[PDB]
Amino acid sequence: NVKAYELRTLKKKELLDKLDELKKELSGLRISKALGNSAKNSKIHGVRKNVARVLTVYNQKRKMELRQLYKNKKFKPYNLRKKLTKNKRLQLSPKQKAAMTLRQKKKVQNFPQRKYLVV
């Protein structure tokens, strides 16, 4: 029934091995079901779940490795890029939006909107 916290520590090969075993077990169960049996029909669900868990663990490991590989370097795969609503991606970064023509900037610096308490 193997829960994830055990599996994080395992190396990828070991994980793969585990997964194959689980798959084999599942296949066996399926075969049994197909044949006139209902002894361990309900065992299958758990096995399936276990398999799923294993897959998840492995997938996340793989993703982490990928991320490590493509750390920085301007361009990246579009997977490892910031998946985010298209419009937002298109949109100008806040900094870009801010960026002021030099005269305007100067003006801002000189005559900023002051605080002035009226009495």
Contacting residues toward RNA, per CB under 7 A = 1, 3-5, 11-14, 16, 33, 38, 41-46, 48-49, 51-53, 55-56, 59-60, 62-64, 67-68, 70-71, 73-75, 78-90, 93-95, 101-104, 106-107
Residue 84 C-beta: closest distance to another protein, Å: 6
Which residues fall within 8 angstroms of residue 46, CB to CB, at 6 or more apart? Answer: 1
User: What single-letter DSSP state applies at residue 41?
Assistant: S
Question: Does 82 sit near another protein (CB under 8 A)?
Answer: yes
What is the C-alpha to C-alpha distance for residues 51 and 29, in angstroms, rounded to an integer? 14
Q: Is residue 85 a contact point for another protein (CB under 8 A)?
A: yes
